[PDB]
Amino acid sequence: GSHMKSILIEKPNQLSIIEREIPTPSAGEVRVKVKLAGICGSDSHIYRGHNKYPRVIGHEFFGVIDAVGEGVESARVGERVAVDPVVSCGHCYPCSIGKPNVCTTLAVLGVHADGGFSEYAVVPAKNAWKIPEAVADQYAVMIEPFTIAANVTGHGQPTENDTVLVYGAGPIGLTIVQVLKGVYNVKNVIVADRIDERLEKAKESGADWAINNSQTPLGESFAEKGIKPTLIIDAACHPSILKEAVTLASPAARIVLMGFSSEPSEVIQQGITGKELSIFSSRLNANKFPVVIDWLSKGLIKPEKLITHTFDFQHVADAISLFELDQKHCCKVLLTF
Amino acid sequence: GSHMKSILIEKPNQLSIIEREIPTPSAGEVRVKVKLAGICGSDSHIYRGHNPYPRVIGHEFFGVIDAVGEGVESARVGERVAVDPVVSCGHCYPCSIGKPNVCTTLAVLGVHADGGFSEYAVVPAKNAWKIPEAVADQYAVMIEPFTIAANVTGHGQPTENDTVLVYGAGPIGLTIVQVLKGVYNVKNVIVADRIDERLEKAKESGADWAINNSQTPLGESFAEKGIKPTLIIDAACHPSILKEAVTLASPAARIVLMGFSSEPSEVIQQGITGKELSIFSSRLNANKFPVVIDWLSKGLIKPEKLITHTFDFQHVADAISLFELDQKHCCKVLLTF
Numbered sequence A: 001g002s003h004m005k006s007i008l009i010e011k012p013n014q015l016s017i018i019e020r021e022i023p024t025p026s027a028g029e030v031r032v033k034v035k036l037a038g039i040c041g042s043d044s045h046i047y048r049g050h051n052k053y054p055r056v057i058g059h060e061f062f063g064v065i066d067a068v069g070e071g072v073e074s075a076r077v078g079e080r081v082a083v084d085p086v087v088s089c090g091h092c093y094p095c096s097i098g099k100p101n102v103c104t105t106l107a108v109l110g111v112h113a114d115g116g117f118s119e120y121a122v123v124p125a126k127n128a129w130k131i132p133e134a135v136a137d138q139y140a141v142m143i144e145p146f147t148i149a150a151n152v153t154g155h156g157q158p159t160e161n162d163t164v165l166v167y168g169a170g171p172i173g174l175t176i177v178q179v180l181k182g183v184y185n186v187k188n189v190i191v192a193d194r195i196d197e198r199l200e201k202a203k204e205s206g207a208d209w210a211i212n213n214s215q216t217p218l219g220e221s222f223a224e225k226g227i228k229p230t231l232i233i234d235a236a237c238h239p240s241i242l243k244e245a246v247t248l249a250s251p252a253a254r255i256v257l258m259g260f261s262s263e264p265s266e267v268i269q270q271g272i273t274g275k276e277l278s279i280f281s282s283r284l285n286a287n288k289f290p291v292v293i294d295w296l297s298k299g300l301i302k303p304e305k306l307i308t309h310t311f312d313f314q315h316v317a318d319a320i321s322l323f324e325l326d327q328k329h330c331c332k333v334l335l336t337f
Numbered sequence B: 001g002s003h004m005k006s007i008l009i010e011k012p013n014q015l016s017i018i019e020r021e022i023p024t025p026s027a028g029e030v031r032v033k034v035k036l037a038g039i040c041g042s043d044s045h046i047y048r049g050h051n052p053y054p055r056v057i058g059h060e061f062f063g064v065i066d067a068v069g070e071g072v073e074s075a076r077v078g079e080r081v082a083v084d085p086v087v088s089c090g091h092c093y094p095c096s097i098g099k100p101n102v103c104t105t106l107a108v109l110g111v112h113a114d115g116g117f118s119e120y121a122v123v124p125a126k127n128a129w130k131i132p133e134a135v136a137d138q139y140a141v142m143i144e145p146f147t148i149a150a151n152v153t154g155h156g157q158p159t160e161n162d163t164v165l166v167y168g169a170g171p172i173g174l175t176i177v178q179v180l181k182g183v184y185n186v187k188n189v190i191v192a193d194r195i196d197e198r199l200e201k202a203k204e205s206g207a208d209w210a211i212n213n214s215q216t217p218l219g220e221s222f223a224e225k226g227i228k229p230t231l232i233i234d235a236a237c238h239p240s241i242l243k244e245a246v247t248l249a250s251p252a253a254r255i256v257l258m259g260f261s262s263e264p265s266e267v268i269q270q271g272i273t274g275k276e277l278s279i280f281s282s283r284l285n286a287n288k289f290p291v292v293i294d295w296l297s298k299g300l301i302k303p304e305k306l307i308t309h310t311f312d313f314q315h316v317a318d319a320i321s322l323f324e325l326d327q328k329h330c331c332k333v334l335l336t337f
Ligand SMILES: NC(=O)C1=CN([C@@H]2O[C@H](COP(=O)(O)OP(=O)(O)OC[C@H]3O[C@@H](n4cnc5c(N)ncnc54)[C@H](O)[C@@H]3O)[C@@H](O)[C@H]2O)C=CC1
Pocket: A041, A148, A167, A168, A169, A170, A171, A172, A173, A192, A193, A194, A195, A198, A213, A235, A236, A237, A238, A241, A257, A258, A259, A260, A282, A283, A284, A285, B273
């Protein structure tokens, strides 16, 4: 009982399950014995080396505090916790205005520092959020994805009367549909994608209109119904999208970007300022764990709709493969411990 | 006594002082006998045919009500008023959310409909705002330009500790500087411009640091001082500025765009979302006349610092030309009646 297994990305396309000493938490830290972890695009991108090595990945994880560091209440041992991967300094400009997600010395667990694809992880005490007993383990592991939705909608401020367009019906887009419908009671949620199976999944998650734009552009589809969205959320993120969103938008609308493309987006300010559009962006989460846990308590969102597969962590390579290849029928994939 | 002179743009590059019947206000309207009007860029653009007629121009004007239409209190006759050029429908989506400035059927006086470069003009009664006796005629006529500043800062929400960069020390940029300093008590207002004489005017209006970036890019000067603005306002509006603003921005910063360039701006989303920037735009004003009128009562802004020249309205062609030439010694030009 002195060592543990961790999934390590040594370099692009080298993933090993290595054995490590069980870590001790320092002051202000806790150790989590991990139960579940989720697979996200960022895990794939690090594995396939699209961007520091070696790195244990995984920023979506849930488990039980088995030990606490100095200055942490030992009563916390035994708590069921989901971990916010955003590690912030708490004193820089972004931190001072409640934006730890863009902290000047931001570290994301499973990205810039070792994360949750590991039998034990040491994390800041304040980042480990207690999950109510009524909230199932599998829903808890999904908190981090839903905090992305919470952060995005927090910028957009959806109203019940908004006409909302969401580009993309992957995992991310779907959590957003769920928050729009179940938390904000938006009456008209429109979702766009090119894959019919994902559009069906969007409907199942509460979309009012699932529109395929692989052949007919949204402009034609919308012109026909007289639709001009008042809130547009880009959960697809190809850089050409922003320019179309601007055209589609109602005057006075707002747009939320989620994409990190290093490729240029071309826009014409005449089209933006002429409609006095607002363009927000969203990165990670600004302390959204409490509110999402609240939503889970109230049954406002439905993670079971999005979880499609579960692999033991030893099969992580298989899990990631499936996640990469299977656009239909695969949504969110979990690793067990 | 039944006729009056108006300034008509018949077509591109053709300005004529014509004779017209003194108009009669209809229901909900008043006739204003104009005392002062201001010249703006949009007046020049309409004169020069920059939008690929005929129109009486002038959206910045002040005068006295001398007739009222049906439904308007007859007591308004004799009122000193400045006119909000924003004419909105009141029932479309933007109007319903308090954004008449982008009303789906917006008409701007002096742009889409006949304006204030005229001895008399008829306008909606609700658009004519009573000016306190203590506020001078030439201050009152400056209300519309200051409402632009009010609208912009409304989006930006400047705080005292914000590090603000304003691009452009033309008349628009200068109103922004005054509002930042005098209304929001921003401690650090930085202004960039290519012309030294205007940078000097920026200082006179309250700017804390006036930087010429005609030769040295702002990136260099900012790097040297360790400056990363938290609020960036583009009152210069060349389409390339946005991309530069994004690189200069602090993380979590916001940017307010004011430009209507039909040429493309290139931005890279990596740089926007990476810092979770918000990009606002501002057009005209959303009911900011009372706000600015209040600022004037309280002495928070100083319009006299911006007024450089006055011409009788018959010399408008000379006036506009001087406004178009001479960036050095000309700021805001008024027409008298
Ligand atoms: N905090 C943040 O900003 C985060 C951003 N992301 C980003 O969100 C995006 C979505 O993530 P996932 O759902 O996991 O990806 P995904 O690739 O599974 O889903 C994207 C979906 O968008 C669709 N799509 C692509 N172009 C489209 C267009 N022009 N119109 C309509 N649909 C279109 C695709 O068919 C695909 O179904 C990714 O680009 C990712 O980088 C992901 C996590 C956090």
